[PDB]
Design an enzyme around this catalytic site. Sequence first.
Site, short mmCIF file in Angstrom:
data_model
loop_
_atom_site.label_atom_id
_atom_site.label_comp_id
_atom_site.label_asym_id
_atom_site.label_seq_id
_atom_site.Cartn_x
_atom_site.Cartn_y
_atom_site.Cartn_z
N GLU A 154 0.86 -1.19 0.00
CA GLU A 154 0.00 0.00 0.00
C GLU A 154 0.90 1.24 0.00
O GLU A 154 0.64 2.20 -0.72
CB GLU A 154 -0.89 0.05 1.25
CG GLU A 154 -1.78 -1.17 1.51
CD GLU A 154 -2.81 -1.40 0.42
OE1 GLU A 154 -2.97 -0.53 -0.46
OE2 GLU A 154 -3.48 -2.45 0.45
N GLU B 79 -4.08 4.90 -1.34
CA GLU B 79 -2.98 4.06 -0.88
C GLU B 79 -2.42 4.55 0.45
O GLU B 79 -1.83 3.77 1.20
CB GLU B 79 -1.88 3.98 -1.95
CG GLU B 79 -2.36 3.50 -3.32
CD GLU B 79 -3.04 2.13 -3.30
OE1 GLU B 79 -3.33 1.60 -4.39
OE2 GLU B 79 -3.29 1.58 -2.21
N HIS C 210 -4.83 3.11 2.84
CA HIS C 210 -4.62 1.67 2.96
C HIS C 210 -3.38 1.34 3.77
O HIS C 210 -3.34 0.33 4.47
CB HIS C 210 -4.55 1.04 1.57
CG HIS C 210 -5.81 1.18 0.79
ND1 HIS C 210 -5.92 0.84 -0.55
CD2 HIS C 210 -7.04 1.64 1.15
CE1 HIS C 210 -7.14 1.09 -0.97
NE2 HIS C 210 -7.84 1.57 0.04
N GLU D 1 -2.96 -5.48 -8.73
CA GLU D 1 -4.30 -5.24 -8.19
C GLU D 1 -5.41 -6.04 -8.87
O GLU D 1 -6.21 -6.70 -8.20
CB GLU D 1 -4.63 -3.74 -8.24
CG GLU D 1 -3.96 -2.94 -7.12
CD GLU D 1 -3.95 -1.43 -7.37
OE1 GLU D 1 -3.58 -0.68 -6.44
OE2 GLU D 1 -4.29 -1.00 -8.49
N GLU E 258 -10.87 -0.28 -4.36
CA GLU E 258 -10.22 -0.89 -5.51
C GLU E 258 -10.79 -0.70 -6.91
O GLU E 258 -10.06 -0.84 -7.89
CB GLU E 258 -10.00 -2.39 -5.25
CG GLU E 258 -8.61 -2.84 -5.68
CD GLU E 258 -7.51 -2.04 -5.00
OE1 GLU E 258 -6.46 -1.80 -5.63
OE2 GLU E 258 -7.71 -1.65 -3.82
N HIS F 69 -8.98 2.02 -8.71
CA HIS F 69 -7.63 1.67 -9.09
C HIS F 69 -7.61 0.76 -10.31
O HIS F 69 -6.68 0.80 -11.11
CB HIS F 69 -6.93 1.01 -7.89
CG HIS F 69 -6.99 1.82 -6.64
ND1 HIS F 69 -6.40 1.43 -5.46
CD2 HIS F 69 -7.58 3.01 -6.38
CE1 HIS F 69 -6.62 2.34 -4.53
NE2 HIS F 69 -7.34 3.31 -5.06
FE LIG Z 1 -4.41 -0.23 -1.75
FE LIG Z 2 -5.01 -0.16 -4.85
#
Ligand SMILES: [Fe+3]
Ligand SMILES: [Fe+3]
Lengths: 72, 511, 387, 388, 168
Positions: B98, B128, B131, B193, B227, B230
């Site tokens: 992360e 991130e 995270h 990811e 997510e 991303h």
């Molecule tokens: Fe992440």
């Molecule tokens: Fe991510």
Amino acid sequence: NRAPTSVNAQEVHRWLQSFNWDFKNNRTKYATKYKMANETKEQFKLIAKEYARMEAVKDERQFGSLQDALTR
Amino acid sequence: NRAPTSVNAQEVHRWLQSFNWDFKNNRTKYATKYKMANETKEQFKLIAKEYARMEAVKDERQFGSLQDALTRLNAGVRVHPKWNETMKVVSNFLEVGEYNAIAATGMLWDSAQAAEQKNGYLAQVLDEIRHTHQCAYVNYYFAKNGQDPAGHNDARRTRTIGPLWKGMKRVFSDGFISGDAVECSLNLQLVGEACFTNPLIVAVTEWAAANGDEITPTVFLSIETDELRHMANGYQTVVSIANDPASAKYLNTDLNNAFWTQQKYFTPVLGMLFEYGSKFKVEPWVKTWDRWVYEDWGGIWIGRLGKYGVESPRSLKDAKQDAYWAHHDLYLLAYALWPTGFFRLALPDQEEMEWFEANYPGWYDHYGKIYEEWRARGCEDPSSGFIPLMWFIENNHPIYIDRVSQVPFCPSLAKGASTLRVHEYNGEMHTFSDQWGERMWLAEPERYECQNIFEQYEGRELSEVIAELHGLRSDGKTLIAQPHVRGDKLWTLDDIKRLNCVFKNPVKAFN
Amino acid sequence: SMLGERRRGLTDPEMAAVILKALPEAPLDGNNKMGYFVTPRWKRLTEYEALTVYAQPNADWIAGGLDWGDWTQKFHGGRPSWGNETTELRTVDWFKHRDPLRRWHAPYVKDKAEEWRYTDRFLQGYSADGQIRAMNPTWRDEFINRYWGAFLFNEYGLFNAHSQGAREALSDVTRVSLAFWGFDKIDIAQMIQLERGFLAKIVPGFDESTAVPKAEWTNGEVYKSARLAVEGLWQEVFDWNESAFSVHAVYDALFGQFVRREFFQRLAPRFGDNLTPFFINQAQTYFQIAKQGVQDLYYNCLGDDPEFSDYNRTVMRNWTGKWLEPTIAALRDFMGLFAKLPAGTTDKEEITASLYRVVDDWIEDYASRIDFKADRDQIVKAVLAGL
Amino acid sequence: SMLGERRRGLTDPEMAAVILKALPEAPLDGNNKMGYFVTPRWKRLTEYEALTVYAQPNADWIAGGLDWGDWTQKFHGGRPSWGNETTELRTVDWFKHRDPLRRWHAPYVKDKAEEWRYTDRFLQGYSADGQIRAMNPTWRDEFINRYWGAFLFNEYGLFNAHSQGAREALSDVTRVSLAFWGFDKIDIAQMIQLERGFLAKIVPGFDESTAVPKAEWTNGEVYKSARLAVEGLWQEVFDWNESAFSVHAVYDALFGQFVRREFFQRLAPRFGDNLTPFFINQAQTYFQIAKQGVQDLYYNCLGDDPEFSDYNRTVMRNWTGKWLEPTIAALRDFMGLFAKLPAGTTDKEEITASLYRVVDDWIEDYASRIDFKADRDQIVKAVLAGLK
Amino acid sequence: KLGIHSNDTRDAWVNKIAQLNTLEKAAEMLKQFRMDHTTPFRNSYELDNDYLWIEAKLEEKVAVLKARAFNEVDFRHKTAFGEDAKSVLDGTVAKMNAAKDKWEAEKIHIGFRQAYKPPIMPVNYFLDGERQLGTRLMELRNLNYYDTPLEELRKQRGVRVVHLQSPH
Ligand SMILES: [Fe+3]
Ligand SMILES: [Fe+3]
Ligand SMILES: [Ca+2]
Ligand SMILES: [Ca+2]
Ligand SMILES: [Ca+2]
């Protein structure tokens, strides 16, 4: 001096007792055998904003638990 | 007309693309072979303030559950010992992933020329960061309220002792930020990811729940909700360079290199953590891996990028061939080197051995017998004077570290791949475990000079390395790492010192 | 089903029994404090520090790193993932920095979210209350739309100036602060457009398109030197610290502060405009927030480093001098804007007083920190020549 | 101990097994919607409505009640706990009202809390930025300290006018709305003092004591009629609706809006004061929020009641006439403050136009809703007589 | 005294760099250190476990001395040796773009790093070169990346194959 400053609840509450003023009809509208003393004080020095913040914090934890983990 | 009026995120995002203007030096500061189109758009029309609000709402629920109900239920304690240990690794190793993703997306933010594409990456930069703090909180919570805080409380320094960490950094640190911005994008978003992290995060909450852990699901499920943005960033990255002629020349190679890089580590590591770091099982890793890599990613996801010239990694079949026994082969090494970890490991119990044999015919005759041999010899008892690494030495089974992926491998014993390539170049020996990594080093030797644990620890006595890198618990004598997960008979620094184990560089046996 | 098919270890009788049976009698270590080995900046270690410090996997060869060895994968050529070679500044430990406001992700988005929701409520009340009726039409259709709107590209440019720092920062505490400084900048830029979009909704013929303010930014005369200074700090600086220092401790502290506080925040009220100051209140709150972090990094940590104090101050005085010139040039081109204000708005006496406020605040909060001997009179005198 | 002594039915193996064994195979009713019998104001029932409507245990003899029978314990003399006798207004259902913002307690304290924390951030940014330097000294020490300060007592009185309604409101939805209208008033009074307290910290010699502002309120001329009106609305009105209606749809809509928006919000900026407007922005936001609720209760629900529309409008027109006179007097006296300003601050035309804005907004948002025939020039001319 | 973060070999170099007190000598030693201990082309691997830390401690001495010796204009535009940063940069980029193949390109880039890595060259010019040099190197290397069979690639790299083992 430009030091970051603010004002808290206790600092405002210090003057709250002075908010009420005298006038002939300033009296309770309800029947009662008693007379509440004019200068009675309160234990907690809160103002509206701070009351809301402290309860908002509790709500976050409560509803968070109910909506997330407890539901799962 | 004095009707209550306001303005929302979309109404502002409407003009975000016009925010950037032209001027001589308005270009990426990072080396790259591709050209991201300056008119690339983003899927989610957000502005800084709305982004904050949507994330704040999630934090509210998450932290509320953790600090209130879960704490009242003693959720941090009522977790199986093996899983408490596994989360030390899972949460901290993911944390670095992360964390580096922050720098990675920052590099992508700098690479994008279209205002909207920059904004998309920016949203991830912040995600991130969220995270990183979320994975940190999991370790923080288990340290504060769990059955064994050691490791959960200092992984940021104790992780440096063991070999599994090196490989983690390759796929979740350096692989995300060192190279062509686009290559990093493929490691992080297109592969990392979309193929692993996304499905992994959910899978982790499933194994967590089965083992009594409701903390991880609370946090990881919240991470998962981010997510989709991303995925779009990764998808948009390809769309941004699809027209650039250089794409047809380099995209499929960077992708294949990216795919191999990520799978090389997770194929064995994730399966090992799930099956060997739990008591209750959710699903056999062979089944999981096939669905993730071949069905979902290799099929559906990669297929949608076909119109952009994206092809299935040429090393895909090779990955499937090497996969089957990979995680089983690795745990043997991880357990043999248990004193170098920052977590406690356990050998499979009777019910588990039956589960392994049922799901992996032939497991018992190889791994099963070895574990029972090590156990009868006393690998769990500190007075035995035995750690499995000694067994590898006795039976001439050298353990190597791939120069590129940093993944430990033992071709002499492995039931899976057993290829080995050793080369010498300008006074230095190099060991490789597969043809893809070998090519990477040969073509780009200066990108891979990572010293392995045998090189760094060569000639050093085991207990000294542990003591020096603070691999001890509060009492200053008991090891953080252990070869069992029971509360009694914990190994101490003295029990290790008496073994007189001194590290040797296995590659020197070829001199 | 009502109960579902999935059995959970915390609530399932069979599984829970197995788990409870495997548990030790008490924790296997009494030290339940994550990040206990981190050196606290304050009385006790804070959540902010525990959750952030050492998250970045630096090895000891990068001042402060706890890991060992080279990176596993580097750039084609050999450049390390992160390295001392990405910035002129040196230190004994890149992890010493601490945001005075101790902001990790949660508190940060909590605060900005509150601002977003209050902003929404404010706008709904402002429109319902009809406060737009008392705003000077020329100030709106000309100075807010064109000149204030143009300033959004300035903030947007300072935002992007943070991109490389997001990638090269040598520590977690520094990367987080940098990211937040930059995110707040884009926020401001988006708030400028939001106001213009709001005006568009409540003012019949107001156009929210960025065409006018953008042309002013790219071609106008008032922001010409401002834009040149921005394009430089953003795309000509490859040193992440020079970029952050020069943007926050030089340019935005002088030019930025003058425009926002000494021009729009000072004049908008005089045209019956309390709308723009609402947003500038945010930008200033943000500026003062970031300032505490900028000061801690470059002065408390770097500028006062036990081993590179002299060295770093020299580098910063060098940077201060390098960008002080383009900044003053930006402030001069901006002076031309006063001649477009209706007669009687302000006088050369007030502006001179406003310039000294900015310069004096700058010298007190930044210049004197690195012993950069600056002359208030010469600077102000230099800027005033733009009238 | 690590596990504790108290065993919980949700996690204790033995106890949970007993519980699971007793559970039915599926829910004993598929209607899992609490408050399903409540008539939704909007498309679908809202959480606001479900958690609020019918919380008040009124019997059917109080319009809209679902219970039956008399209260269990009444006042000495026989007065009911709640009864129709506490207000002149009548309706087919006291539970019809809906706060357009759908505020139940959680959302309400959440928003005010955001406002509090942001306020704190603002003041720390304002003080650190030294913006106080450009504020006109006279405006600060005379108009903010004395006159804006004295206004806190006006808002405080209006807050108190809500006490009886908190006790007498005939439904939950009205009680909650009224409580929130009142709570926002005390908050504004406290924000006025907060500002004075802040100024005392950043301006040497500035006294935060309420003595001066209180003396202005209790014995000055500028606020004399304002105070007389507030004292009346608060303590001479025993009808909870007359109180709420007259405060929000008459006095505060005219006097309050003029003072806050047309005097301080309008003139503070001219003296380099961005501080007071920060707080007035909150007051105006609160004012507009309460207006939506006031309009729904008095115009949508009562003034348009299918059975008592004509009756209720007659009563509200009566109340408007009753309280418009004292309100004009309050505004008339307040006109005296304009003479205290430094020459050239504003003039008769600006003052008149600002009065018309307030009067025209009032006719539009309130008077017209009940067919009250207001004459806007006659009202303004009556107020202008107060200019010195 | 053995150790991962603290050892005799590291203590030896700190006392060594401490003796330095001239930008000229300091800079020269750094340049020579990178030639003998960094990159796959290093003169030897004897300091493999400590060269990264030592190099840094060396860069620090050079940095301090360079700041006290150069004037503002030069600290920003000249190398610790006296060269004109921009000149070196444009020259190296020129040679790189002239490179006929990846083998030549990689040599230019790596050498550039060994010679001008800060504090030698100003970070601004250096990282600008990393941006242009790296771009060219990748463009050449990643073209038909898998065409050359490993057996041949090994000969090209010039490695000494010590052992190969493959069951499949
Ligand atoms: Fe992440
Ligand atoms: Fe991510
Ligand atoms: Ca009078
Ligand atoms: Ca006039
Ligand atoms: Ca008339």
